[PDB]
Design a protein around this ligand. Structure first.
Ligand SMILES: [Zn+2]
Ligand SMILES: [Zn+2]
Ligand SMILES: [Zn+2]
Ligand SMILES: [Zn+2]
Ligand SMILES: [Zn+2]
Ligand SMILES: [Zn+2]
Ligand SMILES: [Zn+2]
Ligand SMILES: [Zn+2]
Length: 367
């Protein structure tokens, strides 16, 4: 059998595999050509990952069928997750901060803090009074920081607003495993995916060249379920793939623009008929060296793997930590205050403790 193997590239090289050939042996043969540990390689066919024990007959692979390989080398409750450009260079939980937008000083006092993503992403959406002297600024300018290490106020990361604390134990749409955090799509059902599958998914589309181009916005991916009007608008979410794969994604304009012009290279490093450049000659029909002879997701997972909602019971209401009078939460803001005048405890919904900067940063609000 011939199967075309696409590995960090648009073109797929052919591999010879017998009827009983194991997915591990395929991942052994691809490891020789590419020189990488087999225990990090992941074979994906039609969107489904193939486990090592499986065989060609079980998979329902056929002649010239395309398989991708992708390489993969009380606790703090975190609402916010960011991409830290350094030193981490990977997605991390972040701290949510605010400042006076008029003077750029982190002293902006909020009557009531933020309740959701729109409150902290839409500029000039919130308001307060700044504690700078001779500063009139009322504008709340929210920013984020990586939480994996200390950071100067100035050193800010971008929030990945789709990445969500899986506090509802929602299973993945791709793998059915309950992970944390998870990416939640902006389709009608708010479909949930784990970040391991988001990676697998983004990479598979890069090799396939199945990215979508929002003309004004750029190139993106919709929900994995194919849902309409679910393109990821916040394109910094592709930073999650890491630099190799992000870098690849950025080069998609170049490569599509060349595709539209009628251009075509099949090297792993990089008028009607030689790479010059890299220096490697090849056929244009089959992409071989110079010499031309010789996608769905399951419905049951899709129903379960939605952000959806929880019907209120018992989450809905909690007694005041100090005085015990029931308080029900309004919106997603964790910052509770007590109307009982002999008490008036400001506390955190989630932690059950007095309100403070840690709760604020880790989870001023929750989704
Ligand atoms: Zn960091
Ligand atoms: Zn100010
Ligand atoms: Zn998954
Ligand atoms: Zn969806
Ligand atoms: Zn080349
Ligand atoms: Zn050829
Ligand atoms: Zn109270
Ligand atoms: Zn808290």
């Amino acid at each position: 059998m011939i199967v075309f193997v696409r590995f960090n590239s648009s073109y797929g090289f052919p591999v010879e595999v017998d009827s009983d050939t194991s997915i591990f042996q395929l991942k052994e043969v691809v490891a020789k050509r590419q020189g990488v540990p087999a225990d990090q390689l992941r074979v994906i066919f039609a969107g489904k990952e193939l486990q090592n024990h499986l065989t060609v007959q079980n998979c329902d692979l056929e002649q010239q069928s395309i398989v991708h390989i992708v390489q993969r080398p009380k606790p703090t409750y975190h609402s916010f997750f960011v991409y830290c450009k350094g030193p981490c260079h990977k997605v991390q939980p972040g701290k949510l901060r605010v400042q006076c937008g008029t003077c750029r000083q982190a002293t902006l006092t909020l009557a009531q803090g933020p309740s959701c993503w729109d409150d902290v992403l839409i500029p000039n959406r919130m308001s307060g009074e700044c504690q700078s002297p001779d500063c009139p600024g009322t504008r709340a300018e929210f920013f984020f920081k990586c939480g994996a290490h200390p950071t100067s106020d100035k050193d800010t990361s971008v929030a990945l607003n789709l990445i969500t604390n899986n506090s509802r134990s929602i299973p993945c749409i791709a793998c059915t495993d309950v992970r944390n955090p998870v990416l939640v799509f902006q389709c009608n059902h708010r479909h949930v995916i784990c970040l391991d599958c988001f990676h697998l998914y983004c990479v598979t589309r890069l090799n396939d060249r199945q990215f979508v181009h929002d003309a004004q916005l750029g190139y993106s991916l919709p929900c994995v379920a194919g849902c309409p009007n679910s393109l990821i608008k916040e394109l910094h979410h592709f930073r999650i793939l890491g630099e190799e794969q992000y870098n690849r994604y950025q080069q998609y304009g170049a490569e599509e623009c060349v595709l539209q012009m009628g251009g075509v290279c099949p090297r792993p490093g990089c008028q009607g008929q030689t790479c010059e450049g890299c220096g490697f000659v090849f056929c244009r029909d089959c992409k071989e060296a110079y010499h031309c002879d010789s996608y769905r997701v399951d419905q049951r997972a899709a129903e379960q793997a939605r952000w959806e909602e929880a019907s209120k019971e018992t989450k809905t209401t909690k007694p005041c930590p100090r005085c015990n009078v029931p308080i029900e939460k309004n919106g997603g803001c964790m910052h509770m205050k007590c109307p009982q005048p002999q008490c008036k405890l400001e506390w955190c919904w989630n932690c059950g403790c007095e309100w403070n900067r840690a709760c604020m940063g880790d989870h001023w609000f929750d989704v």
